[PDB]
Design a protein around this ligand. Sequence first.
Ligand SMILES: [Cl-]
Ligand SMILES: [Cl-]
Ligand SMILES: [Cl-]
Ligand SMILES: [Cl-]
Ligand SMILES: [Cl-]
Ligand code: NA
Length: 129
Amino acid sequence: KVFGRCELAAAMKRHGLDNYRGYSLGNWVCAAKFESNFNTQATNRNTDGSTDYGILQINSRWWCNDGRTPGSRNLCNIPCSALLSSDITASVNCAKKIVSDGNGMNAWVAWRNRCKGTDVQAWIRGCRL
Ligand SMILES: [Cl-]
Ligand SMILES: [Cl-]
Ligand SMILES: [Cl-]
Ligand SMILES: [Cl-]
Ligand SMILES: [Cl-]
Ligand code: NA
């Protein structure tokens, strides 16, 4: 599923991401835009053999099991394929664990390089929330 901007903002708000660990909703929409272009089915392989999955490009090196990342962890206790669903529940719940692990949203490289320090409120401007 390719979400619209305001559609995704509303879904993330319903799932409790607005101001989660102090990160306003616009931060999460901005991260999703540049990680996946709002596409739940996005995948990308990393140099070390791990793979990033879904709307927030969560990495099989630490967070999910895809059966092909030897020596990795599965800290969200899910198969990585669950992060590609049109229902974003699994991605949101795993992202909550990630952002709580000490480094905040700096875990998302695209957030750090393209959202951090910008006017992220623009990403939810005009949306009915
Ligand atoms: Cl957009
Ligand atoms: Cl915001
Ligand atoms: Cl594995
Ligand atoms: Cl949902
Ligand atoms: Cl933080
Ligand atoms: Na893994």
